[model samples]
Target: ACREWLGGCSKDADCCAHLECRKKWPYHCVADWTV
Candidate 1:
């Protein structure tokens, strides 16, 4: 997934292989897990 573009996803595997599901309010695909 693109770093800046937050891709909508149901699970980590739903996102690009380079990213993981980051839950803030709703879960989405993100690159920086630290954030």
Candidate 2:
């Protein structure tokens, strides 16, 4: 799902980190704020 691809990706440390991609906390780094 490219809509939230970056959301569930491996972090810099190679650790599994969830970015959220505006899924839960919309206040975070969302894909499209204009939406």
Candidate 3:
């Protein structure tokens, strides 16, 4: 299972497909293209 957009995460693996965990502290899963 993966974290949806804006969900809490520590790394890219924590995010859903086409998404990545935010790079800053207290990261969140965000859309890849949204960055």
RMSD of each: 3.7, 7.9, 2.3
For model 2, the stretches where C-alpha displacement exceeds 4 angstroms are 1-26, 33-35
Model 2 scores a C-alpha lDDT of 0.35
Q: In candidate 1, how many clashes are counted? A: 0
**Clash pairs (backbone) in predicted model 1:** none
**lDDT by residue (tens digit), candidate 3, 1-35:** 76778889877765756777888877987776665
The residue pairs in collision within model 3 are: none
User: lDDT scores for all predictions?
Assistant: 0.65, 0.35, 0.75
**What TM value does model 3 have?**
0.61
Please, what are the lDDT tens digits per residue for candidate 2 over residues 1-35?
23343344233223223333443532343334353
For all candidates, what are the clash counts?
0, 0, 0
**TM-score head-to-head 1 vs 2, winner:** 1
TM-score of 2: 0.16
lDDT top scorer: 3
Best by TM-score: 3
